[PDB]
Amino acid sequence: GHMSPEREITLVNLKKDAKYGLGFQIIGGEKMGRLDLGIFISSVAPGGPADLDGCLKPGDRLISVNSVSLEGVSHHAAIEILQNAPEDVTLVISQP
Amino acid sequence: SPEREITLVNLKKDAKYGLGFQIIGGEKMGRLDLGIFISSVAPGGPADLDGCLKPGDRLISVNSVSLEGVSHHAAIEILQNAPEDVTLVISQP
Amino acid sequence: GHMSPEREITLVNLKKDAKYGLGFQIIGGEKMGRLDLGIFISSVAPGGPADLDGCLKPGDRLISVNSVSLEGVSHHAAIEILQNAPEDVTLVISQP
Amino acid sequence: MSPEREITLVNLKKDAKYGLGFQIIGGEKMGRLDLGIFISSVAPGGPADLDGCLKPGDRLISVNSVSLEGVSHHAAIEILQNAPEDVTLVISQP
Ligand SMILES: [Cl-]
Ligand SMILES: [Cl-]
Ligand SMILES: [Cl-]
Ligand SMILES: [Cl-]
């Protein structure tokens, strides 16, 4: 027997908008090295793709941008990865 | 190209092999810790025949249930108690 | 590219870096039988000694550090063995 | 209660009369990552004996680059037999 796990993984499918991009901002970065997932959603822009989809929320943990893992990624590099992502993006996130 | 990769793996348990892999990890997990990894993959088993899962891969979820904060002991039970059809989210080098 | 019934044994020669150390992390349990080998590679840092050498990968099994066997060695003790190792390290590992 | 064990690489050459000059024991039903092969005897005057390192009780971990993880006693014998004349063993010792 064990304590029931609390969190879930979700796949969020978004399309970049010329005006919004993906319509969210991030906070954080790795501190503990290669396996550290330190990136979280800091805000979701009203009327943007993430908002309209409805799933992504401030506080959610960002695990991947399509297949690109954010494990061990700095804040700077995470910004880069999001910027360089194609128009069609699936975010793997964990949620409370 | 330095980033790791996130992949989804769909497996069906087999009578002899189960899912066809073993896991390792500690028992003390912080709420957001992901400490479950693959230690071996059985030749002939579903994981092997599927071809994606490898030793060293990091197990992130089982049928959408996150392994964040989940101990090795709890993860074994989750995998053993899982239905025949499982979708795994993993990270890979 | 499926798993082989026979695994592989490999020697890896690394030099510690002042910032990276050996450039990898390990995982394993704390309870070990005297002959158990429960230590495995969990990550390899891009640009670190292990990465540049190109042999060591996550999932590899750590068998010795400069002839010191990991048999019966707990995760906490293995970390200490890697920390206490000199600059020039020879690893014996097993690989899938 | 006993110090860390020691891993050694032993370089031997097969001999026409002695082979490698040692025998092994172990079970047949190994798990994937089990290492259940051990040295049982070392022949006086054969390669292993002359080399001086290998002793009965030692654990045999590999034959050249072939791991004995999950390898049965039967299969280990065949791995040793099939090996070329130049052989490197990885062993563990007390
Ligand atoms: Cl394996
Ligand atoms: Cl690392
Ligand atoms: Cl890695
Ligand atoms: Cl012994």
Side-chain angles (χ1 to χ4, degrees):
Chain A
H2 63 267
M3 301 276 257
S4 181
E6 56 144 314
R7 301 178 63 86
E8 291 180 29
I9 300 299
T10 306
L11 266 57
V12 176
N13 306 304
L14 301 181
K15 289 179 97 286
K16 290 193 170 187
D17 166 274
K19 167 180 174 177
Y20 285 99
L22 287 170
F24 68 89
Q25 299 286 307
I26 53 164
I27 186 175
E30 67 83 11
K31 292 303 185 188
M32 292 317 294
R34 178 63 157 170
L35 296 175
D36 194 8
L37 280 151
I39 308 299
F40 296 83
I41 309 301
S42 63
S43 66
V44 173
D51 186 34
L52 292 173
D53 174 89
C55 189
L56 193 68
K57 297 299 180 183
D60 289 351
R61 190 187 208 173
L62 187 54
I63 297 173
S64 83
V65 182
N66 289 318
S67 67
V68 179
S69 174
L70 295 194
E71 292 161 309
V73 171
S74 74
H75 187 82
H76 181 272
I79 296 297
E80 266 195 284
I81 287 169
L82 286 161
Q83 282 178 347
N84 298 346
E87 154 177 300
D88 305 276
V89 177
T90 295
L91 310 173
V92 178
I93 66 181
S94 71
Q95 298 182 307
Chain B
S1 46
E3 293 83 11
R4 289 170 60 95
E5 183 182 350
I6 304 296
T7 88
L8 275 68
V9 181
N10 301 309
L11 301 174
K12 182 187 179 90
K13 294 182 173 186
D14 170 82
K16 179 184 186 185
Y17 294 106
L19 289 178
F21 65 91
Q22 302 299 314
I23 58 169
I24 47 172
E27 306 296 339
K28 180 135 167 87
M29 229 61 41
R31 179 178 59 96
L32 294 181
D33 289 343
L34 283 158
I36 307 298
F37 299 79
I38 313 308
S39 55
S40 64
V41 172
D48 181 35
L49 297 184
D50 174 86
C52 301
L53 185 77
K54 303 293 182 168
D57 289 347
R58 186 189 207 175
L59 188 56
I60 296 179
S61 63
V62 182
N63 281 343
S64 295
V65 177
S66 175
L67 292 199
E68 284 160 316
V70 177
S71 64
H72 183 273
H73 145 75
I76 289 276
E77 291 195 340
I78 288 170
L79 293 167
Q80 288 186 356
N81 292 346
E84 298 184 12
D85 295 297
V86 307
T87 294
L88 310 172
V89 176
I90 64 178
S91 70
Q92 319 187 284
Chain C
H2 297 278
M3 314 297 316
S4 325
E6 297 127 351
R7 286 168 63 95
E8 184 174 355
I9 300 290
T10 301
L11 254 74
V12 187
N13 298 302
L14 302 174
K15 301 182 63 266
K16 294 191 176 185
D17 176 80
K19 168 164 196 159
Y20 280 104
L22 291 176
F24 66 87
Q25 298 184 103
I26 52 164
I27 50 175
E30 302 290 346
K31 173 64 165 186
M32 221 64 55
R34 73 172 187 115
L35 293 182
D36 288 342
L37 282 156
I39 308 300
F40 296 77
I41 309 301
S42 59
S43 68
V44 175
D51 177 48
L52 297 189
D53 171 87
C55 182
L56 191 76
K57 306 288 185 181
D60 291 348
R61 192 186 197 180
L62 182 58
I63 298 174
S64 66
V65 179
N66 286 2
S67 88
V68 176
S69 179
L70 277 301
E71 289 160 311
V73 174
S74 63
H75 183 250
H76 181 105
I79 287 186
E80 188 181 357
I81 291 176
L82 287 165
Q83 158 200 270
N84 290 353
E87 177 180 287
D88 303 292
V89 178
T90 292
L91 306 178
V92 175
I93 61 175
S94 76
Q95 309 186 284
Chain D
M1 306 300 317
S2 58
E4 274 99 38
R5 289 170 60 85
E6 194 184 344
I7 306 295
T8 303
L9 272 68
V10 182
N11 295 312
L12 303 175
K13 198 130 187 263
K14 298 191 168 190
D15 177 79
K17 179 161 194 287
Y18 291 95
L20 289 173
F22 67 92
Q23 304 289 314
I24 60 167
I25 51 176
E28 309 291 341
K29 303 294 180 189
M30 298 301 102
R32 172 73 171 161
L33 297 186
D34 283 342
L35 282 158
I37 308 299
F38 297 84
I39 309 303
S40 62
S41 67
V42 171
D49 179 47
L50 294 187
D51 173 86
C53 184
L54 201 64
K55 308 289 181 196
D58 288 352
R59 189 184 210 178
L60 182 61
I61 294 172
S62 78
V63 178
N64 291 334
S65 61
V66 182
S67 174
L68 292 196
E69 284 158 316
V71 175
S72 71
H73 181 249
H74 174 90
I77 287 171
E78 298 304 335
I79 284 163
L80 288 161
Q81 290 301 63
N82 278 13
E85 300 188 13
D86 304 280
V87 179
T88 294
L89 313 174
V90 175
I91 66 173
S92 75
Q93 299 178 307

PDB file of all heavy atoms in Angstrom, chain C residues 10-12 24 37 39 61-71 81-82 89-94, chain D residues 5-9 61 90-92:
ATOM      1  N   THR C  10      32.705  -2.339 -19.868  1.00  0.00           N
ATOM      2  CA  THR C  10      33.475  -1.252 -20.453  1.00  0.00           C
ATOM      3  C   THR C  10      34.343  -0.536 -19.411  1.00  0.00           C
ATOM      4  O   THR C  10      33.944  -0.377 -18.251  1.00  0.00           O
ATOM      5  CB  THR C  10      32.529  -0.230 -21.119  1.00  0.00           C
ATOM      6  OG1 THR C  10      31.765  -0.884 -22.140  1.00  0.00           O
ATOM      7  CG2 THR C  10      33.310   0.903 -21.733  1.00  0.00           C
ATOM      8  N   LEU C  11      35.537  -0.124 -19.820  1.00  0.00           N
ATOM      9  CA  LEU C  11      36.371   0.730 -18.985  1.00  0.00           C
ATOM     10  C   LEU C  11      36.293   2.169 -19.487  1.00  0.00           C
ATOM     11  O   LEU C  11      36.372   2.411 -20.691  1.00  0.00           O
ATOM     12  CB  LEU C  11      37.824   0.249 -18.978  1.00  0.00           C
ATOM     13  CG  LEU C  11      38.249  -0.443 -17.683  1.00  0.00           C
ATOM     14  CD1 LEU C  11      37.648  -1.833 -17.615  1.00  0.00           C
ATOM     15  CD2 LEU C  11      39.766  -0.493 -17.566  1.00  0.00           C
ATOM     16  N   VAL C  12      36.120   3.111 -18.563  1.00  0.00           N
ATOM     17  CA  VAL C  12      36.053   4.531 -18.893  1.00  0.00           C
ATOM     18  C   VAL C  12      37.093   5.314 -18.104  1.00  0.00           C
ATOM     19  O   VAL C  12      37.132   5.254 -16.876  1.00  0.00           O
ATOM     20  CB  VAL C  12      34.665   5.129 -18.597  1.00  0.00           C
ATOM     21  CG1 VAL C  12      34.580   6.571 -19.120  1.00  0.00           C
ATOM     22  CG2 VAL C  12      33.576   4.275 -19.218  1.00  0.00           C
ATOM     23  N   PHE C  24      28.703  13.402 -14.081  1.00  0.00           N
ATOM     24  CA  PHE C  24      27.541  12.521 -14.083  1.00  0.00           C
ATOM     25  C   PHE C  24      26.984  12.362 -12.683  1.00  0.00           C
ATOM     26  O   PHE C  24      27.672  12.642 -11.704  1.00  0.00           O
ATOM     27  CB  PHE C  24      27.878  11.139 -14.686  1.00  0.00           C
ATOM     28  CG  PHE C  24      28.864  10.313 -13.880  1.00  0.00           C
ATOM     29  CD1 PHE C  24      28.432   9.485 -12.852  1.00  0.00           C
ATOM     30  CD2 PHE C  24      30.217  10.327 -14.190  1.00  0.00           C
ATOM     31  CE1 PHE C  24      29.342   8.703 -12.131  1.00  0.00           C
ATOM     32  CE2 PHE C  24      31.124   9.544 -13.478  1.00  0.00           C
ATOM     33  CZ  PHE C  24      30.681   8.736 -12.448  1.00  0.00           C
ATOM     34  N   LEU C  37      25.028  -4.978  -6.620  1.00  0.00           N
ATOM     35  CA  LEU C  37      25.471  -3.827  -7.391  1.00  0.00           C
ATOM     36  C   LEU C  37      24.256  -2.987  -7.779  1.00  0.00           C
ATOM     37  O   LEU C  37      23.605  -3.240  -8.787  1.00  0.00           O
ATOM     38  CB  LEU C  37      26.263  -4.291  -8.620  1.00  0.00           C
ATOM     39  CG  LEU C  37      27.686  -4.700  -8.235  1.00  0.00           C
ATOM     40  CD1 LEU C  37      28.311  -5.686  -9.233  1.00  0.00           C
ATOM     41  CD2 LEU C  37      28.558  -3.464  -8.081  1.00  0.00           C
ATOM     42  N   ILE C  39      24.095   0.552  -8.001  1.00  0.00           N
ATOM     43  CA  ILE C  39      24.376   1.931  -8.397  1.00  0.00           C
ATOM     44  C   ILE C  39      24.360   2.058  -9.911  1.00  0.00           C
ATOM     45  O   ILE C  39      25.022   1.295 -10.615  1.00  0.00           O
ATOM     46  CB  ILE C  39      25.745   2.417  -7.858  1.00  0.00           C
ATOM     47  CG1 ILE C  39      25.858   2.162  -6.348  1.00  0.00           C
ATOM     48  CG2 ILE C  39      25.974   3.893  -8.210  1.00  0.00           C
ATOM     49  CD1 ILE C  39      24.812   2.841  -5.510  1.00  0.00           C
ATOM     50  N   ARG C  61      25.663   0.678 -15.455  1.00  0.00           N
ATOM     51  CA  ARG C  61      25.778   0.205 -14.075  1.00  0.00           C
ATOM     52  C   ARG C  61      27.210   0.395 -13.593  1.00  0.00           C
ATOM     53  O   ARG C  61      28.144  -0.063 -14.243  1.00  0.00           O
ATOM     54  CB  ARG C  61      25.383  -1.260 -14.008  1.00  0.00           C
ATOM     55  CG  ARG C  61      25.166  -1.838 -12.615  1.00  0.00           C
ATOM     56  CD  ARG C  61      24.925  -3.318 -12.784  1.00  0.00           C
ATOM     57  NE  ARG C  61      24.325  -3.917 -11.600  1.00  0.00           N
ATOM     58  CZ  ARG C  61      24.007  -5.201 -11.492  1.00  0.00           C
ATOM     59  NH1 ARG C  61      24.261  -6.048 -12.486  1.00  0.00           N
ATOM     60  NH2 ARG C  61      23.440  -5.631 -10.378  1.00  0.00           N
ATOM     61  N   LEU C  62      27.381   1.078 -12.469  1.00  0.00           N
ATOM     62  CA  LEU C  62      28.718   1.403 -11.985  1.00  0.00           C
ATOM     63  C   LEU C  62      29.295   0.282 -11.129  1.00  0.00           C
ATOM     64  O   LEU C  62      28.769  -0.032 -10.056  1.00  0.00           O
ATOM     65  CB  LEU C  62      28.694   2.714 -11.188  1.00  0.00           C
ATOM     66  CG  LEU C  62      30.048   3.206 -10.663  1.00  0.00           C
ATOM     67  CD1 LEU C  62      31.033   3.407 -11.814  1.00  0.00           C
ATOM     68  CD2 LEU C  62      29.880   4.506  -9.864  1.00  0.00           C
ATOM     69  N   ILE C  63      30.380  -0.324 -11.596  1.00  0.00           N
ATOM     70  CA  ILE C  63      30.912  -1.498 -10.908  1.00  0.00           C
ATOM     71  C   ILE C  63      32.141  -1.158 -10.079  1.00  0.00           C
ATOM     72  O   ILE C  63      32.311  -1.683  -8.976  1.00  0.00           O
ATOM     73  CB  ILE C  63      31.215  -2.618 -11.914  1.00  0.00           C
ATOM     74  CG1 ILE C  63      29.904  -3.038 -12.611  1.00  0.00           C
ATOM     75  CG2 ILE C  63      31.872  -3.816 -11.242  1.00  0.00           C
ATOM     76  CD1 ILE C  63      30.082  -4.033 -13.742  1.00  0.00           C
ATOM     77  N   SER C  64      32.997  -0.274 -10.578  1.00  0.00           N
ATOM     78  CA  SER C  64      34.108   0.175  -9.744  1.00  0.00           C
ATOM     79  C   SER C  64      34.641   1.546 -10.109  1.00  0.00           C
ATOM     80  O   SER C  64      34.433   2.046 -11.223  1.00  0.00           O
ATOM     81  CB  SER C  64      35.254  -0.836  -9.771  1.00  0.00           C
ATOM     82  OG  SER C  64      35.846  -0.939 -11.041  1.00  0.00           O
ATOM     83  N   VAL C  65      35.307   2.138  -9.123  1.00  0.00           N
ATOM     84  CA  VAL C  65      35.938   3.447  -9.204  1.00  0.00           C
ATOM     85  C   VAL C  65      37.375   3.267  -8.737  1.00  0.00           C
ATOM     86  O   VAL C  65      37.612   3.019  -7.550  1.00  0.00           O
ATOM     87  CB  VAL C  65      35.209   4.504  -8.322  1.00  0.00           C
ATOM     88  CG1 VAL C  65      35.897   5.864  -8.407  1.00  0.00           C
ATOM     89  CG2 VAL C  65      33.742   4.619  -8.728  1.00  0.00           C
ATOM     90  N   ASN C  66      38.322   3.362  -9.668  1.00  0.00           N
ATOM     91  CA  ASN C  66      39.744   3.123  -9.377  1.00  0.00           C
ATOM     92  C   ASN C  66      39.953   1.850  -8.554  1.00  0.00           C
ATOM     93  O   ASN C  66      40.626   1.868  -7.517  1.00  0.00           O
ATOM     94  CB  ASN C  66      40.363   4.323  -8.653  1.00  0.00           C
ATOM     95  CG  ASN C  66      40.603   5.510  -9.590  1.00  0.00           C
ATOM     96  OD1 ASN C  66      40.278   5.452 -10.775  1.00  0.00           O
ATOM     97  ND2 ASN C  66      41.171   6.583  -9.060  1.00  0.00           N
ATOM     98  N   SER C  67      39.327   0.772  -9.029  1.00  0.00           N
ATOM     99  CA  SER C  67      39.439  -0.594  -8.484  1.00  0.00           C
ATOM    100  C   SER C  67      38.618  -0.800  -7.209  1.00  0.00           C
ATOM    101  O   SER C  67      38.513  -1.921  -6.721  1.00  0.00           O
ATOM    102  CB  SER C  67      40.905  -0.961  -8.210  1.00  0.00           C
ATOM    103  OG  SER C  67      41.308  -0.558  -6.911  1.00  0.00           O
ATOM    104  N   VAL C  68      38.034   0.265  -6.672  1.00  0.00           N
ATOM    105  CA  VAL C  68      37.138   0.125  -5.526  1.00  0.00           C
ATOM    106  C   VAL C  68      35.773  -0.382  -5.992  1.00  0.00           C
ATOM    107  O   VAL C  68      35.071   0.311  -6.712  1.00  0.00           O
ATOM    108  CB  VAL C  68      36.962   1.456  -4.766  1.00  0.00           C
ATOM    109  CG1 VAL C  68      35.947   1.299  -3.632  1.00  0.00           C
ATOM    110  CG2 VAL C  68      38.294   1.936  -4.224  1.00  0.00           C
ATOM    111  N   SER C  69      35.409  -1.595  -5.581  1.00  0.00           N
ATOM    112  CA  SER C  69      34.128  -2.200  -5.965  1.00  0.00           C
ATOM    113  C   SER C  69      32.906  -1.521  -5.357  1.00  0.00           C
ATOM    114  O   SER C  69      32.910  -1.157  -4.183  1.00  0.00           O
ATOM    115  CB  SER C  69      34.105  -3.674  -5.563  1.00  0.00           C
ATOM    116  OG  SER C  69      32.856  -4.263  -5.905  1.00  0.00           O
ATOM    117  N   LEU C  70      31.848  -1.378  -6.151  1.00  0.00           N
ATOM    118  CA  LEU C  70      30.580  -0.880  -5.625  1.00  0.00           C
ATOM    119  C   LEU C  70      29.695  -2.002  -5.055  1.00  0.00           C
ATOM    120  O   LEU C  70      28.572  -1.760  -4.655  1.00  0.00           O
ATOM    121  CB  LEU C  70      29.822  -0.100  -6.715  1.00  0.00           C
ATOM    122  CG  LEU C  70      30.191   1.370  -6.958  1.00  0.00           C
ATOM    123  CD1 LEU C  70      29.991   2.170  -5.685  1.00  0.00           C
ATOM    124  CD2 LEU C  70      31.611   1.520  -7.460  1.00  0.00           C
ATOM    125  N   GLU C  71      30.205  -3.227  -5.009  1.00  0.00           N
ATOM    126  CA  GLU C  71      29.459  -4.330  -4.403  1.00  0.00           C
ATOM    127  C   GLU C  71      29.143  -4.050  -2.939  1.00  0.00           C
ATOM    128  O   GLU C  71      30.044  -3.789  -2.140  1.00  0.00           O
ATOM    129  CB  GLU C  71      30.254  -5.641  -4.503  1.00  0.00           C
ATOM    130  CG  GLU C  71      30.350  -6.203  -5.901  1.00  0.00           C
ATOM    131  CD  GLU C  71      31.504  -7.172  -6.029  1.00  0.00           C
ATOM    132  OE1 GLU C  71      32.616  -6.812  -5.597  1.00  0.00           O
ATOM    133  OE2 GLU C  71      31.309  -8.294  -6.542  1.00  0.00           O
ATOM    134  N   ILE C  81      32.398   7.718  -2.366  1.00  0.00           N
ATOM    135  CA  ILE C  81      33.484   7.138  -3.153  1.00  0.00           C
ATOM    136  C   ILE C  81      33.800   7.993  -4.385  1.00  0.00           C
ATOM    137  O   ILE C  81      34.975   8.186  -4.723  1.00  0.00           O
ATOM    138  CB  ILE C  81      33.153   5.677  -3.587  1.00  0.00           C
ATOM    139  CG1 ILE C  81      33.167   4.757  -2.356  1.00  0.00           C
ATOM    140  CG2 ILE C  81      34.151   5.178  -4.634  1.00  0.00           C
ATOM    141  CD1 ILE C  81      32.762   3.328  -2.639  1.00  0.00           C
ATOM    142  N   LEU C  82      32.771   8.504  -5.062  1.00  0.00           N
ATOM    143  CA  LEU C  82      33.017   9.330  -6.249  1.00  0.00           C
ATOM    144  C   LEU C  82      33.632  10.670  -5.864  1.00  0.00           C
ATOM    145  O   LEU C  82      34.531  11.178  -6.526  1.00  0.00           O
ATOM    146  CB  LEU C  82      31.727   9.544  -7.050  1.00  0.00           C
ATOM    147  CG  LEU C  82      31.243   8.304  -7.809  1.00  0.00           C
ATOM    148  CD1 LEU C  82      29.799   8.466  -8.270  1.00  0.00           C
ATOM    149  CD2 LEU C  82      32.149   8.005  -9.001  1.00  0.00           C
ATOM    150  N   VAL C  89      40.372   9.180 -12.904  1.00  0.00           N
ATOM    151  CA  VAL C  89      39.505   8.094 -12.488  1.00  0.00           C
ATOM    152  C   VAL C  89      39.353   7.081 -13.611  1.00  0.00           C
ATOM    153  O   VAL C  89      39.225   7.443 -14.784  1.00  0.00           O
ATOM    154  CB  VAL C  89      38.113   8.619 -12.068  1.00  0.00           C
ATOM    155  CG1 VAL C  89      37.196   7.471 -11.678  1.00  0.00           C
ATOM    156  CG2 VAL C  89      38.241   9.616 -10.924  1.00  0.00           C
ATOM    157  N   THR C  90      39.410   5.805 -13.253  1.00  0.00           N
ATOM    158  CA  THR C  90      39.066   4.742 -14.189  1.00  0.00           C
ATOM    159  C   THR C  90      37.823   4.037 -13.672  1.00  0.00           C
ATOM    160  O   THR C  90      37.804   3.561 -12.537  1.00  0.00           O
ATOM    161  CB  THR C  90      40.214   3.735 -14.365  1.00  0.00           C
ATOM    162  OG1 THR C  90      41.297   4.389 -15.037  1.00  0.00           O
ATOM    163  CG2 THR C  90      39.756   2.554 -15.197  1.00  0.00           C
ATOM    164  N   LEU C  91      36.775   4.018 -14.491  1.00  0.00           N
ATOM    165  CA  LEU C  91      35.527   3.366 -14.120  1.00  0.00           C
ATOM    166  C   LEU C  91      35.394   2.037 -14.838  1.00  0.00           C
ATOM    167  O   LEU C  91      35.740   1.934 -16.018  1.00  0.00           O
ATOM    168  CB  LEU C  91      34.319   4.243 -14.478  1.00  0.00           C
ATOM    169  CG  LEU C  91      34.260   5.679 -13.955  1.00  0.00           C
ATOM    170  CD1 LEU C  91      33.005   6.362 -14.489  1.00  0.00           C
ATOM    171  CD2 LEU C  91      34.283   5.689 -12.443  1.00  0.00           C
ATOM    172  N   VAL C  92      34.892   1.025 -14.133  1.00  0.00           N
ATOM    173  CA  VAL C  92      34.398  -0.183 -14.782  1.00  0.00           C
ATOM    174  C   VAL C  92      32.883  -0.134 -14.701  1.00  0.00           C
ATOM    175  O   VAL C  92      32.320   0.053 -13.614  1.00  0.00           O
ATOM    176  CB  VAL C  92      34.930  -1.465 -14.112  1.00  0.00           C
ATOM    177  CG1 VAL C  92      34.303  -2.708 -14.743  1.00  0.00           C
ATOM    178  CG2 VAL C  92      36.451  -1.517 -14.212  1.00  0.00           C
ATOM    179  N   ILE C  93      32.228  -0.244 -15.857  1.00  0.00           N
ATOM    180  CA  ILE C  93      30.777  -0.178 -15.917  1.00  0.00           C
ATOM    181  C   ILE C  93      30.234  -1.324 -16.729  1.00  0.00           C
ATOM    182  O   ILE C  93      30.971  -1.946 -17.507  1.00  0.00           O
ATOM    183  CB  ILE C  93      30.287   1.157 -16.544  1.00  0.00           C
ATOM    184  CG1 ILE C  93      30.799   1.288 -17.987  1.00  0.00           C
ATOM    185  CG2 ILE C  93      30.739   2.315 -15.687  1.00  0.00           C
ATOM    186  CD1 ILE C  93      30.265   2.522 -18.725  1.00  0.00           C
ATOM    187  N   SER C  94      28.952  -1.628 -16.541  1.00  0.00           N
ATOM    188  CA  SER C  94      28.264  -2.498 -17.482  1.00  0.00           C
ATOM    189  C   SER C  94      27.220  -1.688 -18.225  1.00  0.00           C
ATOM    190  O   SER C  94      26.673  -0.712 -17.705  1.00  0.00           O
ATOM    191  CB  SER C  94      27.627  -3.716 -16.798  1.00  0.00           C
ATOM    192  OG  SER C  94      26.440  -3.401 -16.097  1.00  0.00           O
TER     193      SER C  94
ATOM    194  N   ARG D   5      35.279  -4.239  -1.568  1.00  0.00           N
ATOM    195  CA  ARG D   5      35.915  -5.257  -2.373  1.00  0.00           C
ATOM    196  C   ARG D   5      36.771  -4.602  -3.446  1.00  0.00           C
ATOM    197  O   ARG D   5      36.803  -3.372  -3.581  1.00  0.00           O
ATOM    198  CB  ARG D   5      34.857  -6.182  -2.974  1.00  0.00           C
ATOM    199  CG  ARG D   5      34.213  -7.071  -1.899  1.00  0.00           C
ATOM    200  CD  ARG D   5      33.008  -7.823  -2.429  1.00  0.00           C
ATOM    201  NE  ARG D   5      33.359  -8.695  -3.542  1.00  0.00           N
ATOM    202  CZ  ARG D   5      33.836  -9.930  -3.415  1.00  0.00           C
ATOM    203  NH1 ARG D   5      34.032 -10.455  -2.210  1.00  0.00           N
ATOM    204  NH2 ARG D   5      34.126 -10.644  -4.496  1.00  0.00           N
ATOM    205  N   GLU D   6      37.485  -5.428  -4.190  1.00  0.00           N
ATOM    206  CA  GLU D   6      38.429  -4.958  -5.180  1.00  0.00           C
ATOM    207  C   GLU D   6      38.089  -5.524  -6.553  1.00  0.00           C
ATOM    208  O   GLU D   6      37.829  -6.713  -6.696  1.00  0.00           O
ATOM    209  CB  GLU D   6      39.850  -5.358  -4.772  1.00  0.00           C
ATOM    210  CG  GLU D   6      40.953  -4.660  -5.539  1.00  0.00           C
ATOM    211  CD  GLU D   6      42.335  -5.170  -5.161  1.00  0.00           C
ATOM    212  OE1 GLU D   6      42.466  -5.832  -4.111  1.00  0.00           O
ATOM    213  OE2 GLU D   6      43.291  -4.899  -5.916  1.00  0.00           O
ATOM    214  N   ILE D   7      38.083  -4.657  -7.557  1.00  0.00           N
ATOM    215  CA  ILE D   7      37.883  -5.066  -8.936  1.00  0.00           C
ATOM    216  C   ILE D   7      39.233  -5.085  -9.639  1.00  0.00           C
ATOM    217  O   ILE D   7      40.003  -4.125  -9.547  1.00  0.00           O
ATOM    218  CB  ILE D   7      36.911  -4.121  -9.664  1.00  0.00           C
ATOM    219  CG1 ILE D   7      35.617  -4.008  -8.866  1.00  0.00           C
ATOM    220  CG2 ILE D   7      36.667  -4.576 -11.095  1.00  0.00           C
ATOM    221  CD1 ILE D   7      34.842  -5.263  -8.776  1.00  0.00           C
ATOM    222  N   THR D   8      39.516  -6.186 -10.326  1.00  0.00           N
ATOM    223  CA  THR D   8      40.785  -6.357 -11.023  1.00  0.00           C
ATOM    224  C   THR D   8      40.553  -6.825 -12.453  1.00  0.00           C
ATOM    225  O   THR D   8      39.671  -7.645 -12.718  1.00  0.00           O
ATOM    226  CB  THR D   8      41.701  -7.380 -10.296  1.00  0.00           C
ATOM    227  OG1 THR D   8      41.914  -6.959  -8.941  1.00  0.00           O
ATOM    228  CG2 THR D   8      43.044  -7.502 -11.008  1.00  0.00           C
ATOM    229  N   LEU D   9      41.344  -6.304 -13.383  1.00  0.00           N
ATOM    230  CA  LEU D   9      41.362  -6.824 -14.743  1.00  0.00           C
ATOM    231  C   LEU D   9      42.503  -7.828 -14.874  1.00  0.00           C
ATOM    232  O   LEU D   9      43.649  -7.494 -14.593  1.00  0.00           O
ATOM    233  CB  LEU D   9      41.525  -5.699 -15.758  1.00  0.00           C
ATOM    234  CG  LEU D   9      40.227  -5.050 -16.241  1.00  0.00           C
ATOM    235  CD1 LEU D   9      39.563  -4.270 -15.117  1.00  0.00           C
ATOM    236  CD2 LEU D   9      40.503  -4.168 -17.443  1.00  0.00           C
ATOM    237  N   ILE D  61      33.113 -11.376 -13.473  1.00  0.00           N
ATOM    238  CA  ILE D  61      32.154 -10.370 -13.920  1.00  0.00           C
ATOM    239  C   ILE D  61      32.092 -10.257 -15.447  1.00  0.00           C
ATOM    240  O   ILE D  61      31.017 -10.036 -16.016  1.00  0.00           O
ATOM    241  CB  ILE D  61      32.489  -9.002 -13.271  1.00  0.00           C
ATOM    242  CG1 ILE D  61      32.276  -9.115 -11.751  1.00  0.00           C
ATOM    243  CG2 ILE D  61      31.615  -7.876 -13.884  1.00  0.00           C
ATOM    244  CD1 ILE D  61      32.737  -7.930 -10.950  1.00  0.00           C
ATOM    245  N   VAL D  90      37.329  -9.454 -16.022  1.00  0.00           N
ATOM    246  CA  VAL D  90      37.082  -8.564 -14.904  1.00  0.00           C
ATOM    247  C   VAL D  90      36.582  -9.419 -13.746  1.00  0.00           C
ATOM    248  O   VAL D  90      35.636 -10.196 -13.901  1.00  0.00           O
ATOM    249  CB  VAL D  90      36.067  -7.459 -15.252  1.00  0.00           C
ATOM    250  CG1 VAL D  90      35.751  -6.632 -14.024  1.00  0.00           C
ATOM    251  CG2 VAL D  90      36.626  -6.576 -16.350  1.00  0.00           C
ATOM    252  N   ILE D  91      37.241  -9.300 -12.599  1.00  0.00           N
ATOM    253  CA  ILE D  91      36.832 -10.055 -11.413  1.00  0.00           C
ATOM    254  C   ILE D  91      36.667  -9.138 -10.221  1.00  0.00           C
ATOM    255  O   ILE D  91      37.191  -8.023 -10.210  1.00  0.00           O
ATOM    256  CB  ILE D  91      37.855 -11.172 -11.030  1.00  0.00           C
ATOM    257  CG1 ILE D  91      39.196 -10.553 -10.582  1.00  0.00           C
ATOM    258  CG2 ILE D  91      38.000 -12.170 -12.170  1.00  0.00           C
ATOM    259  CD1 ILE D  91      40.220 -11.558 -10.018  1.00  0.00           C
ATOM    260  N   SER D  92      35.932  -9.606  -9.216  1.00  0.00           N
ATOM    261  CA  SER D  92      35.946  -8.955  -7.915  1.00  0.00           C
ATOM    262  C   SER D  92      36.483  -9.935  -6.871  1.00  0.00           C
ATOM    263  O   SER D  92      36.313 -11.153  -6.991  1.00  0.00           O
ATOM    264  CB  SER D  92      34.554  -8.429  -7.507  1.00  0.00           C
ATOM    265  OG  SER D  92      33.676  -9.467  -7.106  1.00  0.00           O
TER     266      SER D  92
END
